[PDB]
Amino acid sequence: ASVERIYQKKTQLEHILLRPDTYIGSVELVTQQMWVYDEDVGINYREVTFVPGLYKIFDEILVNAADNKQRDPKMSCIRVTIDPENNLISIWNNGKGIPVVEHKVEKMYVPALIFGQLLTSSNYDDDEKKVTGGRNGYGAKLCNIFSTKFTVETASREYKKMFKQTWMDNMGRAGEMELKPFNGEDYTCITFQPDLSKFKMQSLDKDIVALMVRRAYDIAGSTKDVKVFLNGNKLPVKGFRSYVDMYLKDKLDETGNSLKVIHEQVNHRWEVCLTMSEKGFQQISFVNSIATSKGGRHVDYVADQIVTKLVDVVKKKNVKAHQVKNHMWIFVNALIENPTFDSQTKENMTLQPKSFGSTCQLSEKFIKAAIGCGIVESILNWVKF
Amino acid sequence: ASVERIYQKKTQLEHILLRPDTYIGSVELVTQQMWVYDEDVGINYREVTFVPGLYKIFDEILVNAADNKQRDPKMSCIRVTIDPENNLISIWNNGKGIPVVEHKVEKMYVPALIFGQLLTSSNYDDDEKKVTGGRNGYGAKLCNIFSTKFTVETASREYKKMFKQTWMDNMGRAGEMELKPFNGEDYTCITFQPDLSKFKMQSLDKDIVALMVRRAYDIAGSTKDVKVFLNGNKLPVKGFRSYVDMYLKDKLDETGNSLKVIHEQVNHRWEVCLTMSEKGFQQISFVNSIATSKGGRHVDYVADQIVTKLVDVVKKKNVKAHQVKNHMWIFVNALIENPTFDSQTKENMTLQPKSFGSTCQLSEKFIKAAIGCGIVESILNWVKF
Ligand SMILES: Nc1ncnc2c1ncn2[C@@H]1O[C@H](COP(=O)(O)OP(=O)(O)NP(=O)(O)O)[C@@H](O)[C@H]1O
Ligand SMILES: Nc1ncnc2c1ncn2[C@@H]1O[C@H](COP(=O)(O)OP(=O)(O)NP(=O)(O)O)[C@@H](O)[C@H]1O
Ligand SMILES: CCCc1cc(=O)oc2c(C(=O)N3CCCc4ccccc43)c(OC)cc(OC)c12
Ligand SMILES: CCCc1cc(=O)oc2c(C(=O)N3CCCc4ccccc43)c(OC)cc(OC)c12
Ligand SMILES: [Cl-]
Ligand SMILES: [Cl-]
Ligand SMILES: [Mg+2]
Ligand SMILES: [Mg+2]
């Protein structure tokens, strides 16, 4: 047992491949109940088996595409294609492309820099209060590292050029940089082959495809003025309200009545829905289109208002906060300035509300409509005993 | 508005100081209810205001000290000093010190290598199934980076030497290395002054000191055959059960009765306690002496057995799992082989039970003592309504 074998130093790439968990999530198979979109039945809540890391390297490129809408408000469309046979995933989007020019500081072209070098980002200047999802300068490079082949193509009409380059073998080598004269509609397309040996999978199977499809529906439902192609098929989502309705299409509660939905778009950065939950406290939230599956201070900031109001109400007619919360199923779509998270996977948004860059005070009509639901009634019937 | 201002690349240290959240947690103030050890109140649950990152850089060194017990069973003592007036924290441990010799590969001495270079660890060979908390090779360098002064002292009798060296200015520079002849009992002492400017703090105030002291009590409760000193005073903790008694002593439920405590040390790697909860589902768990404050699959693995058995018991009489779970307050102390987590802060342990390296099937005696709790009675009083 020599010292040189015991104590080792790893490069950034070696550490990412050796310890992928804090970067992309688990690289082992997980079986858990998730919301998916199947070909025949659409949105459904079913138990799925999948590798979180593969799903996450898909989510990174998708959220980058969504952030380009914040970068260029004239962007209108995303196009996602998933071909399991050839193991090929493409994410394309319109709007301003990446500047095709040499970086005077790092001495390489900008797409090569921000797709083949770790810790590269346009979000490192926090004096700019951005509502994009990207924060750390990892996601695209992480998807590159966990792919066998990874091609980036982007066209800039301002620079009148088009860039295309390919990385291979877990970002261990790069192909030929192809530059061509360009003068048409700006676009960005990322096409990658997931390294299924890193995830111990044979091919892109059904569960992972359904999860990716539901993620495309999420992007269609959380962004503004964006249509989403999926294998050339548009996603019929017109607003966060219709997206939320996709989850509760005439689904009844345990007594037989249709679930009552209380909805309000508070402002240009917050849209909230609330309904009854049988499975305890549920939340489906988005921060800058990022699916925050663990929630965060935005969800707390929205839900604690309802909780305090209902607690005061039930105190009038005579209680714990968690009892009120466990009957709530809340949907939040929020745009937060320079959000912080627990990890690269960004499942828990930890930014304090004072730094949100916006507010989300619920209207008195929304609050009164929340009083009308059977939450207060059930809790008041509880407190009697 | 130029390209080189927009698209930027950061070094590892630069990125850590610029984006500390995924490395150490938030560097902003947090106000939330925590368990702390207040002088003359002992352990108590109260609101505290603190910076998570400061707490975490303390926790990293404390956990490393605990890990040395797994490295060397002959180790017997950890000594913690907190001097708020001089902004000094010192963590000393006995057992085998770090080898004081030049690392032939990295061409420098081993302590300097593993405390002044990022991505350096003895835990990178997962063919070795270890139950240490160290996994990534960051923690000690993270404490170094967020300290104005960070001194490592370690003695190796095997190499007949003693190493001492100090880094300053956020691991920006290092002082002179001291190598002295040594032929005594090995030890390792880490002494640092946290860079409180990075945390917008002026001194180690009451709340952060109480949190650090409660963490020392955590270590005294979660480790085996290790004495824990705090400022030279012995912590009167004799096992996980007495540690839990520090939480559940003289506690009463809202009706006026004492709480039923169901305890079992399943094996040398698992110890569990269970009681009632008036605040919803509560858990206090440790993995390899790391406080997993968000829980994880070890907590789920222990709690789902209780939940399913109580569910069967309630189904016998003429209920959902979360309803049973919300009445539970569980304590879990576990040793997990090569655990994985969502982030460097290791608050959520994500390793699947099948990879734990050990099992924890609760005894029929424990299950029967659990069905006799007020959980089943409260659930059936709810069903009667
Ligand atoms: N579809 C896209 N359209 C335009 N710019 C893009 C697109 N995808 C990526 N980029 C740019 O490429 C950069 C690198 O992306 P990425 O590696 O994901 O880092 P990031 O998004 O800034 N932060 P993070 O995702 O948290 O690591 C981004 O910051 C964007 O400036
Ligand atoms: N008190 C100690 N006694 C002996 N060896 C130690 C001690 N503290 C640290 N080390 C060694 O120094 C290495 C660096 O520690 P650290 O940077 O915390 O990484 P790590 O503990 O291995 N993994 P992590 O803490 O999760 O980032 C450890 O892996 C140990 O081999
Ligand atoms: C491990 C992958 C993380 C994850 C990723 C994802 O994309 O979705 C998730 C959903 C999930 O399907 N939804 C619907 C869309 C977005 C969303 C936002 C917040 C909460 C849940 C959901 C989910 O529902 C139990 C649970 C999840 O993690 C346990 C994940
Ligand atoms: C960012 C700090 C993370 C954190 C760190 C810590 O050390 O403790 C915590 C406790 C806490 O006091 N305890 C008691 C001992 C250890 C423990 C283990 C698991 C769960 C809770 C606890 C806690 O109690 C709600 C809540 C916590 O975070 C929300 C934290
Ligand atoms: Cl997160
Ligand atoms: Cl974590
Ligand atoms: Mg990104
Ligand atoms: Mg460590």
Short mmCIF file of C-alpha atoms in Angstrom, two decimals, chain A residues 33 79 148 273 282 384:
data_model
loop_
_atom_site.label_atom_id
_atom_site.label_comp_id
_atom_site.label_asym_id
_atom_site.label_seq_id
_atom_site.Cartn_x
_atom_site.Cartn_y
_atom_site.Cartn_z
CA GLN A 33 -42.99 7.09 -9.68
CA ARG A 79 -37.06 21.46 -31.98
CA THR A 148 -19.51 9.35 -27.12
CA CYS A 273 -52.05 27.25 -9.51
CA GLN A 282 -47.25 18.07 -3.67
CA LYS A 384 -63.74 19.56 16.71
#
